[PDB]
């Protein structure tokens, strides 16, 4: 069957700058009816694919003019004349001309945006979880860019190691910023051993590292 080779796997673009995604094919997509048949689909996170282009260059209903298709034979390209924040997602090329319809690997398109500093929040463990025998302390870095941010846990001012996990949201489809949750998980005994719990955040948007802390007794 036809092998769709898509390049690149990841494509970071600045707002208002063009984007170019190439799709090569093992066999020519020119069909016997003399029309070339290549589709382009867009998959936003958690959603199903949405068809943007059919027949190499034809835009589907509701597809902005910024998306453009072109190509011939084995080599095709999707272009975004000016990339907007709502263009986050994975892009697939598909051929339906041959017996087994085949897709490309997919291209993740990331947005490059102006620096925005995180808003840092800290949530102490709830009392139910403490009753359960575990303590999860949550540090939330909200609405920042770039993705790169250092979060360090300190318990009684001793830097922590190996007991926390990070999760990053998808790049926001409107302001192109990220959010990050660092969760420090301990047993209730380890939690009661100390009193001061703090998360220290370093980011390009912050002139100096920001620390948020609480005392185990109050809040």
């Amino acid at each position: 069957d036809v092998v769709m080779t898509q390049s690149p796997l990841s494509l970071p673009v600045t707002l208002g700058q063009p984007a170019s995604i190439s799709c090569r094919s093992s066999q020519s997509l020119v069909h016997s009816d003399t029309n070339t048949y290549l589709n382009w689909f867009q998959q936003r996170p958690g959603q199903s694919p949405r068809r943007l282009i059919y027949k190499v260059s034809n835009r589907d209903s509701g597809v902005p003019d910024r998306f453009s298709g072109s190509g011939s034979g084995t080599t095709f390209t999707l272009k975004i004349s000016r990339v907007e924040a709502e263009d986050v997602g994975i892009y697939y090329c598909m051929q339906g001309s041959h017996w087994a319809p085949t897709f490309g690997q997919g291209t993740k398109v990331e947005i490059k945006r102006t620096v925005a500093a995180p808003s840092v929040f800290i949530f102490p463990p709830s009392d139910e979880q403490l009753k359960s025998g575990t303590a999860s302390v949550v540090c939330l870095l909200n609405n920042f860019y770039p993705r790169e941010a250092k979060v360090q846990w300190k318990v009684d001012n001793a830097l922590q190691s190996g007991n926390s996990q990070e999760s990053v949201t998808e790049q926001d489809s409107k302001d192109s910023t990220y959010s990050l949750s660092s969760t420090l998980t301990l047993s209730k005994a380890d939690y009661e051993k100390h009193k001061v719990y703090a998360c220290e955040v370093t980011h390009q948007g912050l002139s100096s590292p920001v620390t948020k802390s609480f005392n185990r007794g109050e809040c």
Partner: protein, 223 residues
């Protein structure tokens, strides 16, 4: 109004079978085919099969053992896909898409929302929802952040809504993290006006379809 609606999440034991559904609206169902595509989590799209209510014609990409069977009921405009003798490698999201009625070019112009099928020998586990209460430590002037922590659930997914869907603006539900226990955990947070902490109600609607778990947790401030 051309629309394809698929069934909910599914978890099955190795060896069992699953039958995803796909109900069509907005077009004459008998004039179109249906293509089924598999997307393994984090992987690319893989075409599985095609079935035409117009012809009765069926195509399968790779099915020498007869484990997959695509069917249709034209009377109720519904396509089905059935997978038998399930394996952990069958864990994936399955899509149906409207497709060509005869042997032309497949277009797959409209897709369904998808159906996550998970295969594990382990028991399904319900999540523990704990409040991330808003406080002075979670406030930066005029905005306050609050949330809930959905902890120790298997398998995926959990859907988190706020106030039964009435609060969606500013909601960040984080992707799940794999814990040492093999159970999943995530947090869902939302930023609201701090002046409205006294007058507004914020409730977590945590829904875990595989465990039939529906938890509502009210998040209230702490001083």
């Amino acid at each position: 109004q051309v629309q394809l609606v698929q069934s909910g999440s599914e978890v099955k034991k190795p060896g069992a079978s699953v039958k995803v559904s796909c109900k069509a609206s907005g077009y004459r169902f008998s004039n179109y085919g249906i293509s089924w595509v598999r997307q393994a989590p984090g992987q690319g799209l893989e075409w599985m099969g095609w079935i035409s209510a117009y012809n009765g014609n069926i195509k399968y990409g790779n099915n020498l053992q007869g484990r997959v069977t695509v069917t249709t009921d034209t009377s109720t405009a519904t396509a089905y896909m059935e997978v038998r003798s399930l394996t952990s490698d069958d864990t994936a999201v399955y899509y149906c898409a409207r497709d060509v009625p005869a042997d032309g070019v497949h277009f797959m112009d409209v897709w369904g929302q998808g159906t996550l099928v998970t295969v594990s020998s382990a028991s399904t586990k319900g999540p523990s929802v704990f409040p991330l209460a808003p406080s002075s430590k979670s406030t930066s002037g005029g905005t306050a952040a609050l949330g809930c922590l959905v902890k120790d659930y298997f398998p995926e997914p959990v859907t988190v809504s706020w106030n039964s869907g009435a609060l969606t603006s500013g909601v960040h539900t984080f992707p799940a993290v794999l814990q040492s226990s093999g159970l999943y955990s995530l947090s869902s947070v939302v930023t609201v006006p701090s002046s409205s902490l006294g007058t507004q109600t914020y409730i977590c609607n945590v829904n875990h379809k595989p465990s039939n778990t529906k938890v509502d947790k009210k998040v209230e401030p702490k001083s």
